[PDB]
Amino acid sequence: SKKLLFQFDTDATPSVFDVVVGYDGGADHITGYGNVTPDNVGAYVDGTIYTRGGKEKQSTAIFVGGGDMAAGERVFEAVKKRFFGPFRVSCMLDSNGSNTTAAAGVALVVKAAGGSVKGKKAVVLAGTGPVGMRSAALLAGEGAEVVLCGRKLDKAQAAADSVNKRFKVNVTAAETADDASRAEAVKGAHFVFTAGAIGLELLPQAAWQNESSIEIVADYNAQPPLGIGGIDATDKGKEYGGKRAFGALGIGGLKLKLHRACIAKLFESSEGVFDAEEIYKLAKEMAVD
Amino acid sequence: SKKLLFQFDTDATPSVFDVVVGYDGGADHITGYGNVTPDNVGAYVDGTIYTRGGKEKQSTAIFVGGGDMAAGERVFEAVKKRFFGPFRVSCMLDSNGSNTTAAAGVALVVKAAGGSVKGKKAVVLAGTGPVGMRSAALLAGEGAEVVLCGRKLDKAQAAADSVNKRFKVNVTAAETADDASRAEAVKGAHFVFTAGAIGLELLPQAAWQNESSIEIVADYNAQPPLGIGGIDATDKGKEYGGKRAFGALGIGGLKLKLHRACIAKLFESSEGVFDAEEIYKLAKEMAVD
Amino acid sequence: SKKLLFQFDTDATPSVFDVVVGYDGGADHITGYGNVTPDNVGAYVDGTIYTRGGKEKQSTAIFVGGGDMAAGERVFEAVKKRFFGPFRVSCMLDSNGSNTTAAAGVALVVKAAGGSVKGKKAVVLAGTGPVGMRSAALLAGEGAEVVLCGRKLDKAQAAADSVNKRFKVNVTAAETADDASRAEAVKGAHFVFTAGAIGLELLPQAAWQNESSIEIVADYNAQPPLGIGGIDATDKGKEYGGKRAFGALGIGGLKLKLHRACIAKLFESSEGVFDAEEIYKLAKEMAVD
Numbered sequence: 001s002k003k004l005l006f007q008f009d010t011d012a013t014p015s016v017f018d019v020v021v022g023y024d025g026g027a028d029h030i031t032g033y034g035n036v037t038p039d040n041v042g043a044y045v046d047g048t049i050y051t052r053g054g055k056e057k058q059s060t061a062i063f064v065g066g067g068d069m070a071a072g073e074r075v076f077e078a079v080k081k082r083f084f085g086p087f088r089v090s091c092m093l094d095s096n097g098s099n100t101t102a103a104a105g106v107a108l109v110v111k112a113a114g115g116s117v118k119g120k121k122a123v124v125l126a127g128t129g130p131v132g133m134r135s136a137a138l139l140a141g142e143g144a145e146v147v148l149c150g151r152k153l154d155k156a157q158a159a160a161d162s163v164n165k166r167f168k169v170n171v172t173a174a175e176t177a178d179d180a181s182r183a184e185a186v187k188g189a190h191f192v193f194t195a196g197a198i199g200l201e202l203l204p205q206a207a208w209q210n211e212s213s214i215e216i217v218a219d220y221n222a223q224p225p226l227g228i229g230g231i232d233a234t235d236k237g238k239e240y241g242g243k244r245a246f247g248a249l250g251i252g253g254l255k256l257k258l259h260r261a262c263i264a265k266l267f268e269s270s271e272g273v274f275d276a277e278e279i280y281k282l283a284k285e286m287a288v289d
Numbered sequence: 290s291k292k293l294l295f296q297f298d299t300d301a302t303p304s305v306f307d308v309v310v311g312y313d314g315g316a317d318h319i320t321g322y323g324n325v326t327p328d329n330v331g332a333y334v335d336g337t338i339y340t341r342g343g344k345e346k347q348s349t350a351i352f353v354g355g356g357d358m359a360a361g362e363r364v365f366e367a368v369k370k371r372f373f374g375p376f377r378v379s380c381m382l383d384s385n386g387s388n389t390t391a392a393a394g395v396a397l398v399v400k401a402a403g404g405s406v407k408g409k410k411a412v413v414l415a416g417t418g419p420v421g422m423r424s425a426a427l428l429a430g431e432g433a434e435v436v437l438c439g440r441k442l443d444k445a446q447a448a449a450d451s452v453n454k455r456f457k458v459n460v461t462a463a464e465t466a467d468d469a470s471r472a473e474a475v476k477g478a479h480f481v482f483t484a485g486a487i488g489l490e491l492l493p494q495a496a497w498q499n500e501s502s503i504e505i506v507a508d509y510n511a512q513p514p515l516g517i518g519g520i521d522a523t524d525k526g527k528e529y530g531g532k533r534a535f536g537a538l539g540i541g542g543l544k545l546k547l548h549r550a551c552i553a554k555l556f557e558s559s560e561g562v563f564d565a566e567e568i569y570k571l572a573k574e575m576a577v578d
Numbered sequence: 579s580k581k582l583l584f585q586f587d588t589d590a591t592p593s594v595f596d597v598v599v600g601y602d603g604g605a606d607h608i609t610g611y612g613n614v615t616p617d618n619v620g621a622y623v624d625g626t627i628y629t630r631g632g633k634e635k636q637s638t639a640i641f642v643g644g645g646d647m648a649a650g651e652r653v654f655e656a657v658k659k660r661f662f663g664p665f666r667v668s669c670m671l672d673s674n675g676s677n678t679t680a681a682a683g684v685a686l687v688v689k690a691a692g693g694s695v696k697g698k699k700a701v702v703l704a705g706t707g708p709v710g711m712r713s714a715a716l717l718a719g720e721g722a723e724v725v726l727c728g729r730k731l732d733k734a735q736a737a738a739d740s741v742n743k744r745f746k747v748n749v750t751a752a753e754t755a756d757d758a759s760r761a762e763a764v765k766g767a768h769f770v771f772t773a774g775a776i777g778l779e780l781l782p783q784a785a786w787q788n789e790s791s792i793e794i795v796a797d798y799n800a801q802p803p804l805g806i807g808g809i810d811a812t813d814k815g816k817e818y819g820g821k822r823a824f825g826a827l828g829i830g831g832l833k834l835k836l837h838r839a840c841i842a843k844l845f846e847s848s849e850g851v852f853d854a855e856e857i858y859k860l861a862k863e864m865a866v867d
C-alpha cells in the first residue's frame with residue numbers, strides 16, 4: 001500500500017517546507033489542503049478512515065500545520081474527535097515547525113544546562129508565534145519560570161493564556177515594544193530564546209553578553225540578520241565567555257531529523273499521536289546521541 | 290509513463306476519500322482541483338489531451354467528483370465536450386460516491402430480490418444527495434416505481450426531475466419532513482433505501498420491521514447512529530424475520546472494490562467513459578461473484 | 579532523494595498541462611500552488627532552501643507559470659530574490675508555455691529562414707498573451723523588426739513595453755481590431771506568427787498567400803479552427819508556393835521535447851535558471867537535430 005500523508009494546513013495554502021520533509025521522512029504521496037478549520041476537517045478525516053482496512057490502515061496518516069498555533073490545536077482536536085473505535089489513523093501536529101523546533105531547541109538547551117532548568121528563568125522573545133508558544137510550553141513543563149514577550153501586551157497574554165490552558169502551566173506575558181524593552185526583559189534571566197519572524201534581529205550582542213545571569217541563549221531565525229547578535233547560526237552550544245549559544249542551524253539539524261523521524265512513525269501504526277508531549281520525549285532521546 | 294489521474298471536484302476542495310481510492314486503484318499520481326465548473330474545466334482538459342501521444346495517452350485520466358450531483362453531471366458533460374477526434378482520455382464521474390455506491394447497493398438488492406425489481410415500489414429516504422439520486426436512477430432503470438423523499442418538497446422535486454432528465458425515467462418526489470412522515474412514506478413499499486447524510490438515523494426499527502410489504506432495506510450511512518435502526522452495518526442480506534437488510538459496510542465493501550476496479554480501467558484505454566450505465570453493469574457482474 | 583517540483587502558478591489554480599509535462603520530464607512529485615504573488619512566494623521558496631542540504635539540494639526545483647506574462651516575470655524575480663549564497667534551487671519560468679513554445683517556434687522559423695532574420699519584418703498577431711510576448715522578444719533579439727498586435731492599442735502597447743523592458747529591445751505595438759485590420763498589418767511582412775487564444779482563426783488563407791513579401795508563417799493554435807487558414811497543424815516548413823508554414827503541432831513537438839528536457843535539467847544542479855535566454859539557446863541546439 002502507498003503511504004499517503006494528508007496535510008491539513010490552517011493557512012491559505014499548505015506549507016512547502018512540510019511537503020519536502022514529509023517526502024524525505026517516508027511518505028509516498030502528500031496531498032495538501034489549505035483553509036482547514038475544525039468544521040471542515042471532519043469530512044477530510046472520513047476519507048482517511050473509510051477507505052482502507054486491516055493492515056492497510058496504517059499506510060494513511062494526517063499532518064496538521066499552519067501559522068497560528070491556537071488554530072492548529074483546534075483542527076488537531078477536531079481530527080481526533082472524528083475518529084472512533086478502530087476507525088483512526090496516526091496524526092501529527094507541527095504548525096510552522098512549532099513542536100519539532102521547540103522540542104529540538106529546548107532539548108538541546110536543557111541538555112547543555114545539565115539536564116534540568118527547574119526554577120530558572122527563561123525569556124522567550126517574540127514568543128507569540130507557534131515556535132515561541134511551544135518553546136514556552138516545553139520550558140514551563142521542565143519547571144522553568146517563563147516570560148513570553150511580544151510587541152503588544154494583549155497578543156502576548158493571549159499566547160501565554162493559550163499555552164497555560166493547553167499545558168496546565170503558568171507562563172507569564174510581557175510587552176516588549178522595542179529593542180530597549182527587550183534588553184530590559186532579559187536582565188536576570190538564565191535562558192533567552194529568540195523566536196522572532198524570519199530575518200529579524202531581536203537581541204543585539206550588547207543586550208546579552210554583558211548580563212551576568214544569562215547562561216544559554218538560543219535563536220530560531222536562520223535568515224540573516226540572525227535573531228541574536230554576536231553568534232553564528234551553526235552554533236550548537238558554542239562558548240562565548242561563560243555563556244553558550246545555540247543558533248538556528250544548530251537547532252535546525254535536530255529539528256529536521258526529529259520531524260523526518262516522526263513522519264516515518266506515522267506509518268508504523270494507525271494509532272499514533274504526535275504532538276508536543278511525544279515529540280519532546282523523542283527529541284530528548286535523540287539529543288542524547 | 291506515469292499513470293496520472295486529474296481529479297476535478299465541484300466542491301471547494303477535492304475529496305480525500307477519492308484520493309485514497311484512486312491511489313489504491315492504480316493511479317501513480319493524483320492532482321486535484323476544487324471549484325471546478327463547466328466553464329473552467331475545458332482548459333484543464335486541454336492539459337490532458339495536448340501533452341501525450343500514441344500509447345502514452347491512456348496513461349492520463351480524469352475523475353469528476355463533488356457533493357452536488359447536478360453540478361458533477363454538468364462538469365462531466367463539459368469534459369466530454371472538450372474532447373475531439375483522438376484527442377481524449379478516459380474519464381469517470383463519481384460525485385460523493387454516487388455511482389459506485391448506488392451501483393453496489395442496487396446491484397446487491399436486485400440480486401437478493403431474485404434478479405428483478407420490476408413493478409415493485411422502492412422508497413429512497415433522504416434521496417436528494419448524490420447517492421440517493423443515483424440510487425433512484427438505477428432502481429427506476431430496473432423498472433421499480435421509485436419515490437425520492439426529502440425534508441422539503443421542492444428540493445426533492447428538483448432531485449427527481451434531475452434524475453428523470455438524465456435517465457429518461459419517471460421517479461416521483463415526496464416531502465417527508467420528520468420521522469412520522471418518513472414512517473408513513475415506507476408503508477406499502479417493497480424496498481427502502483436510506484441515503485441520509487452521515488451519522489443520522491432516518492428509519493427507526495419500528496418503522497420498517499412491522500410493515501408486511503417491505504422485503505429488503507438498505508442503508509448507506511456507516512457512521513453511528515446508522516441510517517436504519519435494528520440492523521448492523523456489516524449486514525449483507527441478513528434476515529430479520531421475513532425481510533433482509535444491507536448495511537453500509539456490507540454495501541461499502543463492494544463499492545470500494547468497484548471504485549478501485551474502475552480506476553484501473555481508466556488507464557487501460559484513452560476512450561473509457563465510466564458513469565452510471567457502465568459502473569452499474571460492472572457492479573452487477575461483480576455482485577455475481 | 580525524491581525529485582520534488584514546486585509549481586507556482588499566478589492563475590487561480592496550477593496548469594494541468596504543466597503537471598503532465600513535469601512528470602514526463604523527470605519530476606518524482608509535483609506540488610502546485612495557485613494565486614502566487616511576489617509577496618507570498620518568498621515563504622514558499624523558504625521551504626525549498628531550508629529542507630535539504632549538500633547533494634540533496636538539487637533534488638528540489640521550482641517552476642513558475644500562469645496566464646499573465648508580466649505577473650509570471652514578477653513572481654520569478656521574487657523567487658530569485660529570496661535565494662542567497664548557497665541557499666537556492668534550480669528554477670524555470672514558462673507561463674502558458676511562453677518560453678518553451680516561443681523558443682521552439684522562433685528557432686524553427688529562424689532555421690528555415692537560413693539562420694538569420696536580422697532586418698526583416700515580423701508581425702505577431704494577437705501577440706499580447708504570454709506566447710506572443712515571448713515570440714516578439716525572441717524575434718527582436720534575433721534582430722527582426724517586430725510589430726506586436728492586438729484588438730486594442732493600449733493592451734498591445736503594454737505588452738510591447740513589457741517585452742522592451744525585460745529584453746532591452748524595441749518592439750512596436752499596433753491595434754488590429756478585426757480581420758480586415760489584421761490582413762492590412764501583415765502587408766510587407768516577411769514573417770507572420772499567430773498567437774491567438776485557443777480555437778480562433780486570426781489569418782485567413784487569402785490574407786497571407788497573396789502577399790508577395792511573406793516568406794514564412796507560424797501558428798501556435800492547435801485547436802480547430804486553426805489560427806492560420808490554408809495550412810495544416812502538422813506543417814513543419816511545408817511549402818505553399820514560395821512560402822513555408824509551421825503549424826501548431828509541428829511547433830508543439832519541439833516545444834514538448836524542449837520543456838521535458840528543461841525539467842530534467844532542473845534536477846541536475848541547484849543553480850539552474852531556465853527563462854527565455856537559456857531556453858531559446860537550447861531550442862536552437864535541439865532544432866539543429
Ligand SMILES: NC(=O)c1ccc[n+]([C@@H]2O[C@H](COP(=O)([O-])OP(=O)(O)OC[C@H]3O[C@@H](n4cnc5c(N)ncnc54)[C@H](OP(=O)(O)O)[C@@H]3O)[C@@H](O)[C@H]2O)c1
Nearest residue numbers: 096097101128129130131150151195196197198220252255
Ligand atoms: N531553526 C529551526 O529549526 C526553525 C524551525 C521553524 C521555524 N524557525 C524560525 O523560527 C522563527 C519563529 O517561528 P514562528 O513560526 O513562531 O514565527 P512567526 O509566527 O512568523 O513570527 C513570530 C513572532 O515574531 C514577531 N515579530 C514579527 N515581526 C516583528 C518585528 N518587525 N519586530 C519584532 N517582532 C516581530 C511577532 O510577535 P509580536 O507581534 O507578538 O511582537 C510574531 O508573532 C522564525 O524565524 C522561523 O523561520 C526555525
Ligand SMILES: NC(=O)c1ccc[n+]([C@@H]2O[C@H](COP(=O)([O-])OP(=O)(O)OC[C@H]3O[C@@H](n4cnc5c(N)ncnc54)[C@H](OP(=O)(O)O)[C@@H]3O)[C@@H](O)[C@H]2O)c1
Nearest residue numbers: 385386390417418419420439440484485486487509541544
Ligand atoms: N456505504 C457506502 O459505500 C457509501 C458510499 C458513499 C456515501 N455513503 C454515505 O451515503 C450517505 C448519502 O450520501 P450523500 O452524498 O447522498 O449524502 P449528503 O448529500 O451528504 O446528504 C444526503 C441528504 O441527507 C439529507 N439530510 C441532511 N441532514 C439531514 C437531517 N438532519 N435530517 C434528515 N435528512 C437530512 C438531505 O436531504 P434533504 O435536505 O432533501 O432532506 C441531503 O440531501 C451518507 O451518509 C454518506 O456518507 C456511503
Ligand SMILES: NC(=O)c1ccc[n+]([C@@H]2O[C@H](COP(=O)([O-])OP(=O)(O)OC[C@H]3O[C@@H](n4cnc5c(N)ncnc54)[C@H](OP(=O)(O)O)[C@@H]3O)[C@@H](O)[C@H]2O)c1
Nearest residue numbers: 674675679706707708709728729773774775776798830833
Ligand atoms: N503549439 C504549442 O506548442 C503551444 C504552446 C503553448 C500555447 N499554445 C497556444 O498558443 C496560443 C497563444 O497562447 P497564449 O497563452 O499567448 O494565449 P492567450 O493568452 O490565451 O490569448 C492570446 C491573445 O489572444 C487574443 N484573443 C483572445 N480572444 C480573441 C478573439 N476573440 N479575437 C481575436 N483575438 C483574441 C488576445 O489578445 P488581445 O486581447 O490583445 O486582442 C489574447 O491576449 C494559444 O492558442 C495556446 O493554446 C500553443
Ligand SMILES: [Li+]
Nearest residue numbers: 153154155157
Ligand atoms: Li490584555
Ligand SMILES: [Li+]
Nearest residue numbers: 179182202203
Ligand atoms: Li532588541
Ligand SMILES: [Li+]
Nearest residue numbers: 442443444446
Ligand atoms: Li416544487
Ligand SMILES: [Li+]
Nearest residue numbers: 468471491492
Ligand atoms: Li425517521
Ligand SMILES: [Li+]
Nearest residue numbers: 731732733735
Ligand atoms: Li496606450
Ligand SMILES: [Li+]
Nearest residue numbers: 757760780781
Ligand atoms: Li483575421
